[PDB]
Amino acid sequence: VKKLINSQISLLIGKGLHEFDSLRDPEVNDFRTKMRQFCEEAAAHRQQLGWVEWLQYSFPLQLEPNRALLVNVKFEGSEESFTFQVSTKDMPLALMACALRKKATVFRQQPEEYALQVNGRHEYLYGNYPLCHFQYICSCLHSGLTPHLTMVHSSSILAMRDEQSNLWSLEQPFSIELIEGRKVNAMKLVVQAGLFHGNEMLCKTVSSSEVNVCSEPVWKQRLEFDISVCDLPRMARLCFALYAVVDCPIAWANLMLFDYKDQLKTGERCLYMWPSVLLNPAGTVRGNPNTESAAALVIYLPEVAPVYFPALEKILELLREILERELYEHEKDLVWKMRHEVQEHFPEALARLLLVTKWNKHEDVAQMLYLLCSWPELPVLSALELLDFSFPDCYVGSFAIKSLRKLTDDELFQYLLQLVQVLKYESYLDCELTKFLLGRALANRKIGHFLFWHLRSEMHVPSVALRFGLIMEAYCRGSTHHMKVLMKQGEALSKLKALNDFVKVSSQKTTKPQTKEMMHMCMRQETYMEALSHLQSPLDPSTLLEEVCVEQCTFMDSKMKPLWIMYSSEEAGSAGNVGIIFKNGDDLRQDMLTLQMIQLMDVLWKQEGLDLRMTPYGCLPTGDRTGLIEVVLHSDTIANIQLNKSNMAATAAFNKDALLNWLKSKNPGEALDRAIEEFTLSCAGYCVATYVLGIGDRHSDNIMIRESGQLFHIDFGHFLGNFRVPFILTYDFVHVIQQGKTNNSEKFERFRGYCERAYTILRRHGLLFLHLFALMRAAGLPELSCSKDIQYLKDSLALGKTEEEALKHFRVKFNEALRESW
Template identity: 70%
Template sequence: MPPGIYCPMEFWSKGENQNIQVDFLLPTGIYLNLSVPCNASLGAIKQVVWKHAQYEPLYHMLSDPEAYVFTCINQTAEQQELEDEQRRLCDIQPFLPVLRLVAREGDRVKKLINSQISLLIGKGLHEFDSVQDPEVNDFRTKMCQFCEERAAKRQQLSWAAWMEYNFPLQLEPMAKGLGTGLSHTPVKNIFVNVKFQSGGTRGMKQERGILFSGVDSLLHSASCRVFADRSSPCGFMVFSYFFSPQLVVQAGLFHGNEMLCKTVSSSEVNVCSEPVWKQRLDFDINICDLPRMARLCFALYAVIEKAKKARSTKKKSKKAVGSVHYCTKETTDCPIAWVNVMLFDYKDQLKTGECCLHMWSSFPDEKGELLNPMGTVQCNPNTESAAALVICFPNAASHPVYYPSFEQVGNTDVFLRGFLLQLKEILERRSHTELYEHEKDLVWKMRYDIRDQYPQALAKLLTITKWNKHEDVAQMISLLQTWPELPVLNALELLDFSFPDRYVGSFAINSLKKLTDHELFQYLLQLVQVLKYESYLDCELTKFLLDRALSNRKIGHFLFWHLRSEMHVPAVALRFGLILEAYCRGSTHHMKVLMKQGEALSKMKALNEFVKLSSPKATKPQAKEMMHVCMKQETYLEALSHLQSPLNPSIILTEVCVDQCTFMDSKMKPLWIVFNNEETGGGGVGIIFKNGDDLRQDMLTLQMIQLMDVLWKQEGLDLRMTPYGCLSTGDKTGLIEVVMHSDTIANIQLNKSNMAATAAFNKDALLNWLKSKNPGDALEQAIEEFTLSCAGYCVATYVLGIGDRHSDNIMIRETGQLFHIDFGHFLGNFKTKFGINRERVPFILTYDFVHVIQQGKTNNSEKFERFRGYCEKAYMILRRHGPLFLHLFALMKAAGLPELSCSKDIQYLKDSLALGKTDEEALKHFRLKFNEALRESWKTKVNWLAHNVSKDNRQ
């Protein structure tokens, strides 16, 4: 370890007024040790250093202070140049309290911007500079130029257009009709929201020449070297009858998730530190039949032989050698690592020559397959510990081989009009069952009829296309040029990993360009995940997202945080980091806002770590007081004031209300932080900061609930949903919006009861609480709000398979709106205890809910039947939009959520929406679930009883 005092991150979160001894290394070779405040800025520290340096030798050799810049070793053991002298020492958090002054070189403004971008995206730009990859360099140059051009155009905008960009107006979705059952009272003021829409942009067309080769083989030879970081002596004698594990490399060619030909495997070699095969692997496919997006997938695995005694029904024959018996052998494949590589580079050239592929050690859970075609084509950046596979692509010809551009192919098919009815039946099947071979042949033969009469069935046509036949590929790409523009639903489907072809992707993006900003924001979460499927850095989706982000600051804001939150993932850090760099260069004025938010999040994380350390040693009031003392420091007050809310950038958080802040009792001690709102009469804004919990599943669930709300309102049904804000900002860190003036059902029941054991069965507690919050005529409106929202969340939680429902994650607003929180389990992944399923009802509909809906009357069946009607109507609306939910969840498989990793998880949606049934059968199915939820609600009350007794945390 290097000499000096190691300063962990916790060291810098101590009292702001403390001083620290810092070693300063001057350019003249002079060493100074000075005591400086932790919260001092670099500019102030430099003045102190110069004041003391004038009494030291060689002072006359120093230039002006502005000619020098501080450098330090940061917490990741890298040398960092500190260009921004407004930053405080406690925010920089150097690994050692040592600062070195070096002569400033180059353009200071440019270096300052680079330094700020590095800090903002969580990755030094020098790491991109050191990557010896022409694709990275070309992409950076092209995207930076693209974004800077957009920024230059933005500078020429009129005042109104500039305001539209910075503060985009939002159109709140509203029910078309007033027939939702709500009682309406005349109001004096009418608020009108106006929304601007942005137009589309044109894509770029590139043409390439083609050179064919008749060589059948693709991969010439392969060898693998697995580098071990340590060696261990063998502690026992190895005899010949011990089984020795063998290493094997398996390889396969894929186009999306379709295997182009049979996989091939190397021979077996003994396990050693540097195994070598030097073996030729041949694939049963011609080079001319390779699709443009073909990828070569490798898996390194060990063949382990298990010893098993021989079985006999008569006699056990034992042939002993010493004390050892002969045994039968069984083998199992133990996966070690995988890696993927594209066959064509980003310039469309077939790869040749030797390349070293650093492999990934994590494997997908689904099916336990060795090859991982859905995985990234980026190599593992952790080259020191990763296994390295060295392969060599042969020279297929004496000249470079390029993939061709599309060529128009004449229509030589006969219109089979007699099969149109059969074709219609095949294309309109709602189930996603595999087509028979004769059906595939019919679909392919009638592809022109599909284009003209059923253009929305493009995905099915692409699915049956033979991507390992270049003639079919050429005809499909040619046909795509004349295909009509698709609706958004069908365009989103084409972004799935199953359709990797670049022309298909470009066609899908062109169809998405008609999306309004509000609609694009609705699907932004999925579009960011789709970036992980892209094989090359420069793609249409990246340019589309950057273009729209630079045209609307709200989209830019959330695009930034969706990308920034996954910068800790090695497989996407390079791609996401380059996109973030491009966005920052195209929106330098937005960088200041984002840096302020990043500083606030950094302080929240430090505060949370402080609370975690102090809470076990003190009572909650004492820990809360220590938290307040920490927050009242100048550095915290400055960081947590005058910033745009990351959850909603249209809200300005003026100052933090320290006395109203606290922390929650759960394991990770989430912070409950309250801010003043700049808007007049806006009231307080509450934010929960979580550190240690993955919020991505909550984000997805809330996005789906918000989408359901939009779909219902489009059909004239306003169910008073509360899709509160939630944003993942980093590795298991994020923010959740606090719904003010609300309480949990557990707190309401416990506060209205004398004992926790009886609270769950107090059916009057909810109604009495609503009466206390809504006196007089307001009670009827509150009950109506409760009825509508209860119907919405009953349907939403059933369709999405939300689990772990108890009285502490169901809340009610004082206005009567019911809503659910904490979506840690969904898609039917319910919790079990001792092998017993804790979720015993399709959704939560207890008798105390019914008691409120019926206004406290036992015979008010009219109100309850109206509630049932809301549920049935809401369910049937979602069912009509079932494919949209399937596509959105399928696109999220790239996120790596534990409960959304395979097709079985999405199957739950198909079952809950009864997509394989008729409307009449589906409605009957839902009515059975509704009656079951009501009939078995006593089981829910028993669960709530156990929860209330074990976690009596009434407030």
């Protein structure tokens, strides 16, 4: 059985576990055994949870960041139901009390013994929360749909739980010998080497002598650094670049000077080099796995004496306010001078003090660290800044994790993408962040779900495959059941890839109806019907994908030929009707980031009572240029609508009326007012989001509208002004906001108010977007490469201004945009 699990994991993670063994690496081995131990103890804890705690683990509450309403309620084992009237103020308990008295009366004759499932979804209502605090009940209001709920007993919940069972002495200057290498080029070769602590060099870089491109190179040269060996901090990182010169970069390679066991490295090392984009401090500290083809540099670390980094107990043994809200040297001197005053009176300015300490002097690092061990815990926002590559010391990293533990699950979920990216920064396999992520994943199935997929989606990238593979393995040890749920998802995705490939080939040799009918026959094979049906959605594990509806599946006969895959569920009713888009050929990372940031804006806006009626649909990279997009049904593109086709109800005298006619046709009579407002609200949201993010190239083809009037955006390709993008007001949208009229300053200025409110709210969390984007630099995204991209966000949110000035500025941008509209 242990054999079966091992092969299932291998298949799941896309890496054979045998590959871990073959490395004969003590660090990997230690990583695997400790992290197995921890994950198994988590599983143990879980299988004895109380039933409400179980639900909390498996179906975490979906909450929003008097009024009468109707709700249909039924019981698990019978199709008879009752439509109640309740208040949006009532708790689930009262609703459950109603349903039980109703059951008692029909059957002719304890609320606490139950939870309420949302029909056909893995979503549950429970706890002391008025129904409208639940996303599901609150959402049902706006659509006007009747909530459909199922009473589920504690014995039924516990059956689910049950079924899911499993030193200071050395003063001589640092030096290495560069022995030789084995590369390819056109000219002389040179090797540049530097020691770094984060972004900052600990001393000047040092270089080789020029040697001809012929070789198989041989250097035999000693490179000595302007830094004392006793001054090397724990996280010292030695960085190499190899290049050609008459500047023609070839390869790079980094290593920690200390290994994972606190020992200073000696003696000889062969460095399998990564092919180039000169010095790459942020690049991984492990060698290129393609040892067959990679360039390799052999160096010698000198046996300075075993010398371990000194322990904490030995470490522990050893005018201002103005600037404190980039700094000159004297200014730096004052911050350091007043470090105690920083701890006592400005604890949230920790990062700035860290950025002034001389990490290249051990006495000073000791002074800094001594204060850090007594330092008060910081707000979440501050902890996120401290995960930046600028702060590699694992005492700081420990400190940061420590302050990060107060993240709610919802917040953790919100920042998860970024935290995963920071793993790529890690100096060693076993690290606090990994342990933290795994623990939270093991405690929350939703967290566990997305952590899995964030890692899986990168297994094709050699610099991270080892790390991410080891983490996924450990997770699987902690949940055998969830592993099988995820295999089912990976099996569906393998089949979608094969189906997409077929469609791509077929569509070149034949017409769209011809390929569609062929697609359907492919899908109706037993192997496909089975693999594609009865799974949890990768986009949202609480959405169940029941029977694939073949007749409604199709593809876009253009570009990457993405697939449109529909599902239905009797048990979920109208809510069981959901679709996914499978796409293979495009990097989906940028789309996901963009959509998560828009979703963040919506959260922050809602936290201040502003609902801009946004459409935060799922987008999830799953593999090499592969992932899923959540279908928003009942929506069309502006371009399609603007095609202004005759023989329809939207057909107009003038093209500018097309969009309003379509809205009218979807929202008869009294419904029209509301659709126009939904349009106005979402328009303001998306106009502010795309402006703040620098998302240009917006046109009728990549904007959609729902039949409610909610506007939204698709196919994000370019952000942060990678084509300074102006604020955009489109005539046709302005035309709808103004209810069809040539002038309607009342409606248009209400619309301006929305934009201004949305914009000023985002400014107040300006720092949150900055720390998040900063962490994202670890992704490798080409439009998120350097300072210039971060700076885009500063200029968009006008952070260095008072709210008064920034608003003034935003207004000219807005006014300039109304001018551009005809």
